């Protein structure tokens, strides 16, 4: 386990800084302030998941279509398995880690006008307690992430992008093979590993449910048929690793 | 409207 297999080191070289939500703690929360400094840190992350891609390998080498995909369908998932990881890594998984500037503990979720959906996305963090999920495996786990859903009718560059997710499955079993050493261990792990991962599937919709709902609160028949397809199933293709 | 976001991101730099 000692050395760190060189793509996962360029993986890790490649995460974004921190980002910080902007959000002004020291003033009391309201549900308005908090749901600003959301979709504030929001858009910064999604820009910054642009830039990590790329640098991915393997990604710029992709129709331009197929990238712009790519990134649509999979920025939530993204960013609510980033919030995961910040939760475990900073406070062992017991809050919300959004952003330095934006950490929820319990009480903060309770009042923060959308307890449900903490819960939910607190689902990721314990997990990844239970699992002590390593940085390494992360990093992989991550990248399978961007590239777990594609059209009904699959991508422009669909041989290339098979090649290009089969090379970062090969990558999570290496992550896996350093405190894994074992053949009946090892693969024990990847099938909990990447259940987990299909598991996100139907946690990520929630999340684009909860979007629109908070919109639509906000405020319509057009808005709401271009985000259908993000939270009903049977129109796009969930890539997944178990059936 | 994300769409446009990230296709002007993606060719950026
Ligand atoms: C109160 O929540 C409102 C949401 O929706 C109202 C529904 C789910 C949220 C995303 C959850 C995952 C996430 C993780 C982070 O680390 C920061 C932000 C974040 C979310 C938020 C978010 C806002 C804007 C954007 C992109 N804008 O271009 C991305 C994510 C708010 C929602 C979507």
Redesign the interface.
Known sequence: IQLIPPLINLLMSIEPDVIYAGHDNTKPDTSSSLLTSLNQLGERQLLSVVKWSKSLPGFRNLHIDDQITLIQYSWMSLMVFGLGWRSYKHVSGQMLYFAPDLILNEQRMKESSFYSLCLTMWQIPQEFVKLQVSQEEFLCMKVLLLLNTIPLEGLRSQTQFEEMRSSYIRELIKAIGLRQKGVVSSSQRFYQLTKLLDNLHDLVKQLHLYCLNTFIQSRMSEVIAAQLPKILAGMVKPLLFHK | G??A???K??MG?
């Open positions: 994300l769409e976001i990230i296709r991101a993606l730099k």
